[PDB]
Symmetry: D2
Subunit: 411 residues, 4 copies
C-alpha cells in the first residue's frame, strides 16, 4: 500500500503510513551505509528550526498564517518526538545534511497537509520547499539543528549528570575525611593523606569539568540560521536571522543567538571543536577517577584493598567483586578520545563557503554527550554512592608502613 | 506476562517472550549506557563458539549427546541471525564481555530446553553455566568471538567491497587511457599525464590496501579459546583448546587456529590494533581518492571541470564523495580509541573488549558499505569532460618546454612570459611572434610524447 | 678535568666547566632517549620557581638572606637563559620531572656557591636540597614550572602571533570588499559573495580562536606549588603556597594563583588538556584558512585562479605562472602536528595514578611544541603570504561572466542555461544571441551586487 | 666572511665555511618555524640518493665521469655524517621537501667543486641542478629519501632494540618459571599462574610486534625515484628508475626496489601509514608491559610487592622511572600515528605535500621506541628480581584455591570455608582443618597450586 511522491528527478512510491517524501525515499536507496540513523536529538532540533522559521516567516509577512499555523502544529509533533519513525536516513549522507533537512521538510509538509485535510504527497496546501523550507538553505538549517541539539543535550543531560556525580563525591569526602591512608606517587608508598582528601581531588576535577563545559556554551549557542546558501543571507527576508534565533530561544528556553558572522558559521564549526575539547577534558578526568577507584577496590587480598565497591552482578569466589561500573565508564572515556580526534579532523576539512562534514560532527558530539552523561549517572548510582572504606585494611597497612600520622596531613 | 529466572542474587522476571535469563535481565538495568547494542556479528560469533564448544566437549567425552545436540541446534539459530532479538545488551558493559557471554549461555540454554520440551527458566536439562559454558570462561570466550566476528566481516564484507571498487577503477583506467590532462602538484599547473594514469594511482592504492589487510588476517585468526580465566587453561580438558579451534574453523570455512600463547591472547589484543592499522591505512587511501574525485568534479564553470559525476539527488553535488570521506574520518577516530584501549590491559586481562570489538566492527561496516556505495553510485558512472580537458591543455603554459629544443631556452621563456602577461596561448605567442610556423608548432608541441620516460 | 659530585647513591664525576651535579649526571647516563632536551621555556620556569621559593622562604624566616640572596642571583641567570647549556636532560625521563627539578637545584646551588666564593660540588654554603629545594617537592615544582612555561608562551608568543594574523586578515577584508566572486558549496559553483566577505570568515575564525585561548588561561594560571609530595602541603611552611604564587606573579607579570585543591593539581593536569583543546581548535581553524588560500591561489591556468600569492622561492623564467603555496604547506603541516600532540596530551592526561600524574614532561613537551609551531607558523604565513596576497580581478570577473549561477524575463532561464551549458558559451551569448532579451535588459537584470545580501 | 651565491631571484651571502647555497640560505628566512631540523637520517638518505643518481646517470652515459666521481665522493661525506652542520633547515618547510633536496644539491655541488679545486658558489664544474639533481625532481627525491631513512632506522635501530628486549624477557621467563603467583583479572584476585607464564605473555607480545613490523618493510622499500615531477618519469632516462633503485640497494645493503606505480608513490604514502601502524601496535604492547611491571613493582609495603626493580637514581622504595620513560614514549607514538595518518589522507592530485611532517613523525617514533626499549631492557628488565617470600605469602593467604577442595568435600562446603575465611580474615587452611572438613595432611595433598596452572 503506497502513494506516489514526486521531485525534480521523477516519481517514487512511498509507504502510505509514512510521512516522508520523494527525497527521503531516494536517500534510503542511495545511502545504504552503516548502522547509525540521525540522532533523535537532531530530528527534534530540525523540528525546532522548521517551527521557528514558520513563526519568523509569518511575523515578517512572508507566510500565510493558514499554512504557517499548520506547519507549527506539525513541527511540534517532530519536536515532541512523536514522528521519530518517519526519519529513516543514516548519518552517512551528504555532508551538509541536505537529505535530513529535506526529510524534515517532507514530514512536516505531509503531516500539515493531513491536518488541513489535503492529499498527502501532493505538496498542497503545504509545500515542502516553498513553505516548510522557506527562507532557508540546508546549508544553514542543518548546522543550526546541530548546535541546538548539542547545546540541549549538554544542558539537559550532561551537566546535570556531572552535578549528580559531584554531589555524590562530596558526600564521600565528608564520610571519609577522618580516614588516614598512605599516599602513592609513582605507585610507590609515600606520605599520608585522608581518603576524604583524595576524594576531594576527584570532586574538584568534576566541578572544574562542569565549569569548562559551561564556558564553551555561548559559542555553541550562536546559530548559522539566516546565512542561507553561502552566508550572504540571500533569499531570506531582512531581519530573519535575528527573528528566527529569538523564536528558537523561546521554544528551547536556552539563550540562542544569531552568529555575528555567517561565513564563519557555515564554513567551519570551530565552536563544536572547542566545546568538544571541554568534553574531551571531562573524559580524561572521569577516566582517571574511575581507574583510581578500580585499583583502590582491588583484592580482596592480593590488591590494594582500600575500597569495597558495591556488587551489582551475581557472584558464586567470595569477596571477588569486579569493578564493572569503572569498566563501563573508562571504556566510554576512551570512545570520547577517539570521537574528539574525528571531530577535530572533520572541523579542519571545510572547503570555501561550506564545511561538508556536518552529520559526522553532530554524530560524534552527540554520542560523546550521551555516553558520558549515561555512564556518569550509572557510575554514580551503581558504584560511588555505595562505596565503603575498608578501615581495618587501611589502618593495618598504615601501621605496617615504612613511610612515617594526624600531624602529617597538614601544611 | 513474565517468567521467573534465577541467579545467586535471587529471582528476576523476564518476558515469557524472551529466551534470555537472569544475568542478561540484570545487565539491562546495570548498564543503561548509550545507543549501541552488541554488534550482530558479535552475537553470531558467540553462537559459533557455543556450537563449537559443545561439539568439542562431546568429542572429548565431557558432554552428553542428548544435551550437546540440543545446544548445537539452539546455537545454529543464533549463528543464522534468527535470535538477534534475544540479545538486548549494550556495548558499554563489563570490559571482558562477560554479560554478553552470559546472554549467549542463557539464550542457547533456554532455546535448547524448549527443543527438549523442558521448562524454560529451570536450567534443566540444559544448564547455561554447567553445559553451554562448559570448559570456558567469559575471559576466553568473548575475545574469541571478537576475533571471529572481526575476521568474518573483513573476509566477507570489506575485502570483496574493495575488490569491487578496484575493478571499477581499473575499468576507468582503460576508458581514460587516451585522455591527456595537465598534472597538479602543490595544486599548481604541472607537466601532463593521462586521466588513465591518474586513475591507475587510485586503483593501485586500493590493490595495495587489500594486500595490507590480508597480511594481518593470520593474526586475527589466532583464538584465545582454551586460555580459560587467566590463560593457564585450568578447567578446560587437555586438547580442548585445539579441538574447539578446529570446530570453529569448520563452522566458518576460515582457517582459525588456537593462539600459541594464551596469556598474550587474554592480556592484550595487539593483533586487532595491527589489523585495524591496515583498516586505518585503507581509510587514508580511500579518503584521498574521494577527495580527488570531489575536486576533479568541481564546477560546472568555476571549478576544475575535469569529471562529470553521476547526479543521484534532485551542478552536481558529489554526495557519495562526502559520505565516503566522512566514513574515513570516523575510522581515524575509531583507530585512536582502539589503539588506546589496546594499551590499557592490566595483568592477566584486557577489560576493554566490547569497546574494541565495537570500533573495529563499525570501521569495517562503514568502509565496506561506503566503498560499495561509492563504486555503484559514483565511480561506475564517472564521465571525463574531454572538451574541458583539451581546452585547458591548449591554454596551459606548461607545454613551453617542448619548444626549447628547436628555439632555445631564452626564446621559450619569452613566449611563456608574454603569454602569461597577455592572457594568451603559447601558439598565439609562438606563431604570432614568428618563432615558429603553425605547421612546426603542431610538430614540436606533442603532449602524447610528454607522458612517458 | 672533572669535579667529584655526590648523592645518596654514591660519587660521580662531572665536567668541571658545568654547573649541574650528581643527579643530573646520573640521568644523562640513565635516560639516553630521543633527540629532545627539556624545552628552554621549562628551564626558565624552573629558575622562576627557585627564585620565587627562595624569596618566599626568606619572607617566612626559614632561609638565611646570605644564602637566599645568592640563590636569587643564581636563579636570575637561569631565568635570563644564561645557563641553558647546564641542562642536558631529555624530555624522556622520570614522569614527575624529578631529574630536571634536581638539575635546577644543582645548577642554582653550584652557581650561587661560585658566587659566594665557595667550592662547587661541596653543597656549601648552598645545599641543592636543603636550600634551593627548601619547602618544595619535585611533585609540586615541575607541574608548577609546566604551567608557568605554558602560560608564558601562550601569552607572549601565541596570542600576539594570532592578533598579528587577525590584523592582516582584516586589511584584506577592506581591500577585497569590492570584489564579487562565485561562492563554492560542496566545491560546486554557488551564489555570489565578495572576496571581502569570504576573508571576514577567516578573520572571525582567528578572533574567535583568540577568545577561546584567553578563556582557558585562568585555569592554566592555578599553580600546584605548596602541595608538596602528595598534596597535603607537608614540609612546607604555613602560608608558603599563597606566598610563592605571589612571588611567581611578581616575577612573570602574569596573574598566577595557588590552586584551590592541591590534590587535583598534582594527580591530574586537566586544565592543560582544556587549554590545549583551545589550541587544537585554533589549529583546525588555521588549517582551513591556509587550505582555502592554497586552493584559491591555484593555477595559473588549470586551477581556481582567484588569488596571486607572493613567490618566496625562486622559479624558472620558463615558468612565469607557477607559484607553490609553500607558506600554506608549512602551516597546514604544523596544524596536523598539533592534532597529534593533542591526542598524546589527552591520553597522558587520563593516565594519572592516585596522588600523582607521571606523564608531566610528555605533556609539557607536547603543549610547548604546539605553542611554538603555531606561533611561528602564524607569524610566517602572515608576513610571507597573507600581507602580499593580491586578488586576480580580471580572472574573477571573467569567471563571474562565464558562470551559470546568475540565471535566477520568461522561463527559458533554464533553457538559456542548458544551451550555454550544452554549447560551452556564456549566459549573455544565449540570452541576447538567442533573442530572449536585449543587452541593456540583460545588464539591468543580471546584477551580482544585488545578490550578496538579504 | 661570506660567499655570494646566486639563484633566479638574485645574489645572497652564505657564510664562507658553509657548503650550502642560495636556496638553502633563502629557506632559513622563509621558514623560521619550530625547534626541529630535518632528522639526520633524512640528510644521510639524501646523500644516498645523490650518490645513487650520479652512478645511475654515469652508467646510462648521461653524466661525465669527471663530474660524477666528484659527486660520488662528496655525497659519501654526506652519507657518513661528516657534513651534518651544513643542513640547517627545519622540518616545517615546503611539503614536497624541495628545500632540503636543494640543500643536498648545493652542499654536494660545493664540496664536489672544492675537491676538483674549483670556485665554490660558481656552480662550475659541478652544478647543483644540472649535475647533482640530474634526472630528478624534488617531488620524487625527498620521498625516496624518506622511505630510505624510515626503512634503515627500523632495520638498524628498532628491530634490534626489540630483539634485545625479547631476549631479556625470555631470560626472565626461565628465571620465574618456578614461581607461582595469584592471577589478576579486572584487578581482582584470580586463579594462579607462574610469574614465568606472565612474562611469557610479555615476551610473546614483543616477538609478535617484531613480526608485524617486518611484514610492513617490503612496502616501505618501494621507492618513488624515477617518477619525476608528476609520476610519468618525463626528464629521466629510460631505465633510470630501475637502475637508481639498484644503486640505492647496493649502498644500503637493503632490498630497495622501484615502486611499480609512480603515481601511487608520489600522491600518497600509505606504505608509511601501514608500517607506522605496526609501530603504533608495538607501542601499545610495550606500554602494557611497562605499566604492568610498574604496578607489579609497587610498594615496597602498600603496593602489590611482587617485583623488586633495580634502583638507578634516588629513590625514596624505588620509583619505576624506566617504566615512566617508556610509557611516555609510547603515548608519544600514539599521537604521532594520528598526525601521520591524517597527513597520509591529505594528498592532492599528483602529489602529497605533507612529506617532512610524515618523515619527522615516523623517525621520531622509531628513535624514541628503539632508545626506550634498549634503556628499559638494560636499566630495568635485566635486573628485575622476584620477591618470592612476598608472593608465596600472598599465595597462602589467598581464597582463590578453595576450588581444589571441591571434588573431595563438595562445592557447598568449600564455599563455607571461603566465606568464613573471608569474614574472619583467616586462611583457607585454618578454616578447612580447624572446621574438621579435612586433616592437615589432606589439605596439603589436595590444595596444590602447581597442579592448577595448566589444562585440567
Amino acid at each position: 500500500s503506497t502513494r506516489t511522491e514526486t521531485d525534480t528527478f521523477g516519481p517514487i512510491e512511498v509507504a502510505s503510513d509514512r510521512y516522508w517524501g520523494a527525497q527521503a525515499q531516494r536517500s534510503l536507496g542511495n545511502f545504504k551505509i552503516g548502522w547509525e540513523k540521525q540522532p533523535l536529538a537532531i530530528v527534534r532540533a530540525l523540528g525546532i528550526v522548521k517551527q521557528a522559521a514558520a513563526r519568523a516567516n509569518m511575523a515578517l509577512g512572508r507566510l500565510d498564517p493558514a499554512i504557517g499555523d499548520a506547519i507549527v502544529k506539525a513541527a511540534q509533533e517532530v519536536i515532541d518526538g512523536k514522528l521519530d519513525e518517519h526519519f529513516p536516513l543514516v548519518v552517512w549522507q551528504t555532508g551538509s545534511g541536505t537529505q535530513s533537512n529535506m526529510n524534515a521538510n517532507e514530514v512536516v509538509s505531509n503531516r500539515a497537509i493531513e491536518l488541513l485535510g489535503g492529499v498527502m504527497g501532493s505538496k498542497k496546501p503545504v509545500h515542502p520547499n516553498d513553505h516548510v523550507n522557506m527562507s532557508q538553505s540546508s546549508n544553514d538549517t542543518y548546522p543550526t539543528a546541530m548546535h541546538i541539539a548539542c547545546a540541549e543535550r549538554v544542558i539537559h543531560d550532561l551537566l546535570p549528570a556531572l552535578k549528580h556525580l559531584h554531589k555524590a563525591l562530596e558526600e564521600k569526602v565528608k564520610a571519609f575525611d577522618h580516614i588516614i591512608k598512605i599516599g602513592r606517587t609513582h605507585t610507590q608508598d609515600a606520605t599520608p593523606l585522608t581518603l576524604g582528601q583524595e576524594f576531594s581531588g576527584y570532586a574538584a576535577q568534576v566541578a572544574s569539568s562542569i565549569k569548562r563545559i559551561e564556558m564553551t556554551l555561548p559559542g555553541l549557542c550562536e546559530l548559522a540560521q539566516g546565512g542561507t546558501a553561502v552566508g550572504t543571507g540571500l533569499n531570506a527576508p531582512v531581519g530573519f536571522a535575528e527573528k528566527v534565533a529569538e523564536e528558537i530561544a523561546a521554544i528551547t528556553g536556552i539563550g540562542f543567538t544569531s552568529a555575528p558572522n555567517k561565513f564563519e558559521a557555515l564554513a567551519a564549526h570551530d565552536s563544536m571543536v572547542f566545546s568538544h575539547g571541554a568534553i574531551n577534558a571531562t573524559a580524561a578526568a572521569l577516566f582517571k577517577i574511575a581507574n583510581d577507584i578500580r585499583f583502590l577496590g582491588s583484592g580482596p587480598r592480593s590488591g590494594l584493598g582500600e575500597l569495597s565497591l558495591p556488587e551489582n552482578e551475581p557472584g558464586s569466589m567470595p569477596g571477588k567483586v569486579n569493578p564493572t561500573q569503572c569498566e563501563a565508564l573508562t571504556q566510554v572515556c576512551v570512545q570520547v578520545f577517539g570521537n574528539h580526534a574525528a571531530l577535530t579532523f572533520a572541523g579542519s576539512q571545510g572547503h570555501f563557503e561550506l564545511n561538508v562534514y556536518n552529520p559526522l560532527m553532530a554524530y560524534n558530539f552527540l554520542q560523546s554527550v550521551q555516553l558520558l552523561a549515561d555512564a556518569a549517572i550509572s557510575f554514580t548510582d551503581n558504584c560511588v554512592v555505595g562505596i565503603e572504606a575498608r578501615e581495618d585494611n587501611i589502618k593495618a597497612a598504615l601501621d605496617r608502613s615504612l613511610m612515617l600520622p594526624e600531624t602529617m596531613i597538614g601544611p
